[PDB]
Amino acid sequence: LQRGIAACMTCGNTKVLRAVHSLLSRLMSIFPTEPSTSSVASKYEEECLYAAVGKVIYEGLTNYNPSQLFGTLMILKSACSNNPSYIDRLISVFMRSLQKMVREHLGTSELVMLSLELVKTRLAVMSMEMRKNFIQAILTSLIEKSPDAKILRAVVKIVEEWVKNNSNQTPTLREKSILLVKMMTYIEKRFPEDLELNAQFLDLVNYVYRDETLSGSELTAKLEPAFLSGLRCAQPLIRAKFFEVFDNSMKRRVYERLLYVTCSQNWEAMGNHFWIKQCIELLLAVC
Amino acid sequence: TGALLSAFVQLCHISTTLAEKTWVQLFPRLWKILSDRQQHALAGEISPFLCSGSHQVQRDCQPSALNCFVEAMSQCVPPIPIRPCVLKYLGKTHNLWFRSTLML
């Protein structure tokens, strides 16, 4: 069967790639082609013949779409099922098609981008040469010019997972804060009605403010508008979880809170809001 | 009492009207309990906060926050120190025309 199933890997789609996904259960065992040479497989590789096509598929997609796009999606999902790592050579040629399809916007491309962001974010190995371009493309397309809300929600998910880990330090504070501020700026401007991704971003910033405070305290300076917006949001649970952290940061004394709200708090970032109700919140919670 | 204040605040959240009034009616109550040492500094630093520079986006807000804040401040018993220039500025920019004239 190793000689035959390879034919299906040639992207004879006819909606059979979903059936090729069935072979993922087999790859969950070892998939030893990445951690070592390809010759470490024992009479089930002829994963050499499959990795070969998975690598060569970049040809048509980079030399120029939905067909080859879904083919790449499924083949990289199957190959990256068990072993999350893969050689940099294929990334360097595949991530070009990402931007090429991104700038082509002028339906399945959304799912392709979702899968690609899922597969690429597992490991970061570039020496800040192309990774810069990766983060720039992210912040300029998935946040600024993303037409669909699902891809924005997915990038919010990936950056949440990035800020969530604590062990190993794959992300860095600079690009993290850049992504966070670009989100704060655009996510609420271009998607005000879709409260789902807004609540997700607000939960992300609430976690950033709540957990890992001993490590990060400079990032809070730029994200003041995000915190204020989450405090004045129309959702009661988000407002409550934001006020519970806004209150504990100050002494439970009426004079201290009054001085704070009168000289240390800047309401400019609020924006045409009746912020005095937050003053009522703060003055009545200390009772 | 904790069950009353939480629901009171959650009710003031949704209604901008009848919540401005709560601040107008509660702030002077707070001023009453503040000692002279606290009241002096608070009144001396409120004017910088009445200006507060870029806190002007409320210029087009119907119930501008500065309106409610200066109303509450004026409704206190001892609030002597307030500059007339800032009063006229608030009256012109914000919807404080007649209140500012009465104070002046």
Partner: peptide, 16 residues
Amino acid sequence: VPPRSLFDRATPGLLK
């Protein structure tokens, strides 16, 4: 810049 933070509870000028 000093270890400042707009979210912190820095309340200056209590008697100045």
